[PDB]
């Protein structure tokens, strides 16, 4: 038996529709489900569908097409707080045995209203001149490159959300143990700035 989802990670601009689909091989299947799993958390049931057509819940729409044997999930007016992995599941028993798809990571990237891309040097609070660099405030179209050096470390971008100001920002962190290393070098590899 086959339950098969789209492969990810899928990048979606804030405000657009994130979409996943799932095809299933067993034409008898009665019940279809979408579970959402935040990173390091458990799968949480978000949509159930049993009959052909559309079902709706807030910003979620599920569609079941029994003739073509797929279930979809549409996430309308996508929010960065929707960034998670979404898992198709299909019932395979007359008890309710569940078979899961492999899941698809959705990344909803924030709409950065006032881009101010900059790189900053941060100092250790106590530890005698230890060095970390922060790339922050760039737009969501911006790619961050691993400047492939042995001991220069660079994280993927991550999105923080200051609720008290309705302000999101992208950032990426780089560091190295004192190997001819300054913040000028750290990021440049991230393909073509402004």
């Amino acid at each position: 038996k086959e339950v098969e989802q789209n492969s990810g990670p899928l990048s979606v601009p804030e405000g657009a529709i994130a979409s996943l689909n799932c095809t299933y091989s067993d034409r008898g299947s009665q019940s279809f489900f979408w579970y959402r799993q935040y990173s390091g958390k458990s799968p949480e049931l978000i949509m159930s569908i049993y009959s052909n057509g559309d079902k709706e819940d807030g910003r979620f729409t599920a569609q079941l097409n029994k003739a073509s044997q797929y279930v979809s999930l549409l996430i309308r007016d996508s929010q960065p707080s929707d960034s998670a992995t979404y898992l198709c599941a299909v019932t395979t028993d007359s008890w309710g045995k569940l078979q899961f798809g492999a899941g698809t990571q959705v990344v909803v990237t924030p709409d950065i209203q006032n881009p101010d891309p900059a790189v900053y040097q941060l100092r250790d609070s106590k530890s005698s001149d230890k060095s970390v660099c922060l790339f922050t405030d760039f737009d969501s179209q911006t790619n961050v490159s691993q400047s492939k050096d042995s001991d220069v470390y660079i994280t993927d971008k991550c999105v923080l959300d200051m609720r008290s100001m309705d302000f999101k920002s992208n950032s990426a962190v780089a560091w190295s143990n004192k190997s001819d290393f300054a913040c000028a070098n750290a990021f440049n590899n991230s393909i073509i700035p402004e």
Partner: protein, 245 residues
């Protein structure tokens, strides 16, 4: 008031050790399942149980035993740990067709890392880096970074605390750790986090900021014949005060 609970949340095992994953279910649900989830294949059923006294095999039963002597408890047992049993295990339950609904409720998961050699275990070093004064003056905001480095296995929980209270707004933590040595199998890990506050909040010197990393390591009297301190389950933290600048 509990729901589905799993104990322990995290475990290291040396290859060949046995272990038992506890699963407890408050809600009197008839049906319980155990799944593994691996960073490639989604959730795979291992064993399931329709009722007390009854267990049956899922699609990957091999290397695992299960028991259901009571309705509340469905422990999962690994007779002899193999590295490929490194995974996250989820226990799930549902009323079970006498109680009607098909919704499966999931426990919070148990992360398991199987290693060749327990000499591989290392707690994190943890440091906080104070905001740039350039960021402060161009943006009127202030980002602190937390760095946790050199830990194995990658069983940590990093939290940010301001004036004694855990915060979530203004925070992101890498979803994935960096491997310090990518081509190495029991490589140690690095994690970063950021907390961003207004410049004005960071410039108040009575404001306290603490990055806290709970590491899960060696515990219930594992043997330790080495020079360095036993890498036990512990919290490692770093902190800073606001700065009028």
């Amino acid at each position: 008031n509990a729901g589905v609970t799993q104990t322990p949340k995290f475990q290291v095992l040396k290859t060949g050790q046995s272990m038992t994953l506890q699963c407890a279910q408050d809600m009197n649900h008839e049906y319980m399942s155990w799944y593994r989830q691996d960073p490639g294949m989604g959730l795979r059923l291992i064993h399931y149980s329709v009722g007390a006294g009854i267990t049956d095999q899922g699609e990957v039963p091999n290397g695992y035993n299960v028991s259901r002597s009571t309705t509340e408890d469905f422990p999962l047992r690994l007779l002899s740990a193999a590295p490929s049993q490194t995974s996250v295990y989820f226990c799930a339950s549902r009323p079970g067709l006498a109680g009607g609904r098909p919704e499966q409720y999931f426990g919070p998961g148990t992360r398991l890392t199987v290693t060749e050699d327990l000499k591989n275990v290392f707690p994190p070093e943890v440091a906080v880096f104070e905001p740039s004064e350039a960021e402060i003056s161009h943006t009127q905001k202030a980002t602190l970074v937390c760095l946790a480095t050199g830990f194995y296995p990658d069983h940590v929980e990093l939290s940010w605390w301001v004036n004694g209270k855990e915060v979530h707004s203004g925070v992101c933590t890498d979803p994935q750790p960096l491997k310090e040595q990518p081509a190495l199998n029991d490589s140690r890990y690095a994690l970063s986090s950021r907390l961003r506050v207004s410049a004005t909040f960071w410039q108040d010197p009575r404001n306290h900021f603490r990055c806290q990393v709970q590491f899960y390591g060696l515990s219930e009297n594992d043997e330790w014949t080495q020079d360095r301190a036993k890498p036990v389950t512990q919290i490692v933290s770093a902190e800073a005060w606001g700065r009028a600048d």
